[PDB]
Amino acid sequence: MTHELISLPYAVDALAPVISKETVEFHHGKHLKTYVDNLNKLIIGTEFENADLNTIVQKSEGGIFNNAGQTLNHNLYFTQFRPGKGGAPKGKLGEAIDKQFGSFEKFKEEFNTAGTTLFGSGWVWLASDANGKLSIEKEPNAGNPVRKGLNPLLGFDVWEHAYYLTYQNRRADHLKDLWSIVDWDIVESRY
């Protein structure tokens, strides 16, 4: 399989100010292109040469995993956002968040805390298991819930390249602002 650099479903300046034009250009246009390019090179000659992306994340190790994990993480990341929304989840997912976390507000707070306290580079993920149970997963570096057999629903990138141009060291502020661009219709569809 020759993995592709996903096409963004909105203009590069669509998520500003929370994710600026410049950040999208570097984050999607350079960092992700690199992860995709590296993944495609490393898998040739291995058992993952013709495997789907999810299988690679589930089974690979080392460099292949680092690039496969990052490719999947970013594909989910850029596709879950849209300008002018945010707000709150509804349907089956909104009801499940209320039941398991207490309320949407409490969920956001625990999620913000998980992302703020993750030391170094990584991702904070809302994931669901086979019985529909929700959990907040802290994933160092290239981690993704698919490695644990879980379904990734919403992931915030806390690698510094995701927010440094606009927020510098203010990661908690960036995380608080991200809720404003989450497209819950797309997230609910993942659940």
Interacting span for a copy of itself (CB under 8 A) from 6-14, 126-134, 153-161, 175-183: 153-161
Q: Quickly list DSSP for 134-159.
A: EEEEEEETT--GGGGTPEEEEEEE-S
Does residue 142 touch a copy of itself according to CB under 8 A?
yes
Per the annotation, where are the binding residues?
27, 74, 157, 161
Question: Which listed residue (6, 164, 172, 180) binds a copy of itself by CB under 8 A?
Answer: 164
User: 171 and 74 in contact (C-beta within 8 Å)?
Assistant: no
Question: Which listed residue (160, 173, 177, 188) binds a copy of itself by CB under 8 A?
Answer: 160
Q: Which residues bind Fe ion (CB under 5 A)?
A: 157, 159, 162
Question: Residue 165 touches which of Fe ion, a copy of itself, none (CB < 5 to 8 A by kind)?
Answer: a copy of itself
Question: Residue 152 touches which of a copy of itself, Fe ion, none (CB < 5 to 8 A by kind)?
Answer: none
Classify residue 78 by burial, with Cβ atoms within 10 Å: 0-12, 13-18, 19+.
buried
Does residue 187 touch a copy of itself according to CB under 8 A?
no
The torsion angles phi and psi of 42, rounded to 5 degrees, stand at -65, -30
Please, what is the Cα angle at 50 between 130 and 62, to 5 degrees?
Answer: 75
Q: Of the two residues 33 and 133, which places its CB atom closer to a copy of itself in the complex?
A: 33
Q: Quickly list DSSP for 30-98.
A: IIIHHHHHHHHHHHTTSTTTT--HHHHHHH--HHHHHHHHHHHHHHHHHHTB-TT------HHHHHHHH
Site string for a copy of itself, 18-47 (x = CB under 8 A): --------x---xx--x-------------
Q: How far is the CB of 44 from a copy of itself (least distance, A)?
A: 19
> Is 176 in a helix, a strand, or coil?
helix
Does residue 61 touch a copy of itself according to CB under 8 A?
no
Spatial separation of the C-alpha atoms in residues 15 and 13, rounded to whole Å? 6
Does residue 109 touch a copy of itself according to CB under 8 A?
no
Bridge pairing between strands 134-140 and 151-157: unpaired
Per the annotation, where are the binding residues for Fe(3+)?
27, 74, 157, 161
Q: What is the binding site for a copy of itself (CB under 8 A)?
A: 26, 30-31, 34, 63, 66, 119-122, 140-142, 159-161, 164-165, 168-169
